[PDB]
Structures are given as structure tokens and as C-alpha cells.
Amino acid sequence: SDKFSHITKDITTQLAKFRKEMPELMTGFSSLAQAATKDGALDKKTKELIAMALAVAKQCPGCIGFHSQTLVKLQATREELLETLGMAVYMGGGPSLMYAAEALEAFEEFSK
């Protein structure tokens, strides 16, 4: 019931080490991430929906964890999430359907 909470927490504790021990690298990465996700022609929620689809296509539970968490914070609706997942399924078939299930689980977990 706290599967993705644990995944994201555990990754975050390792990432704190990276930020201390590879500070130039992580500063560069942070700049990339912030530039990619900032408000622009596409708003932040829309970019995070794009991120969620990518997370599912890349079959990465950590990404699914963090971006579903962010989507809840950005107040994405369940319907907006499902429709993003549908795009991943169309462009990934069976395996993306499996990770779409995980993304729904993550989103529901972080939704309370």
C-alpha cells in the first residue's frame, strides 16, 4: 500500500549522496530538468503528463513513482492520467499496458 512511497524515498536517499559527491553533475542535471519542466507554451501539468507517458514507455518504476507524485501535486485529474497512459499503450502494446497498471497504482497511492 506504500510501494511507490518506498521506491521514491529510497531513490531520494541515494540521490542526496549523488548531490554531495557529484555536485557539478547533479547541478547540471537539475538545470536540465528545471528547464524541461518549467511553464511555457505547454503548462507544467501537461509536461508532467508527457513525463508520465515517457516513464511508462521506459518501464521505470522510479520515474513512474516521482512523476505520479508530481501529477497529484499539480492536480492532474484521473482522466488526464488515464488518457496519457492510453497513448503509451498505443505506442507500446502489452508491456506498456503492464506499466500503465503500475502508473495507475502509483497515482492512486499518492492521491491519499
Residues of the shown chain interacting with its own copies in the complex, contacts defined by CB under 8 A: 10-11, 14-15, 17-18, 21-22, 24-25, 27-29, 31-38, 40-42, 46-47, 49-51, 53-55, 57-63, 77-80, 82-102, 104-105
d(CA 91, CA 57): 8
Cα(57)–Cα(29) distance, integer angstroms:
21
Q: Which does 105 bind (CB under 5 to 8 A by kind): Na ion, its own copies, none?
A: its own copies
Does residue 63 bind Na ion (CB under 5 A)? yes
**Neighbouring residues of 109: CB distance < 8 A, sequence distance ≥ 6:** 1, 2, 3, 4, 5, 68
Which option in its own copies, Na ion, none does residue 41 bind, with CB closer than 5 to 8 A by kind? its own copies
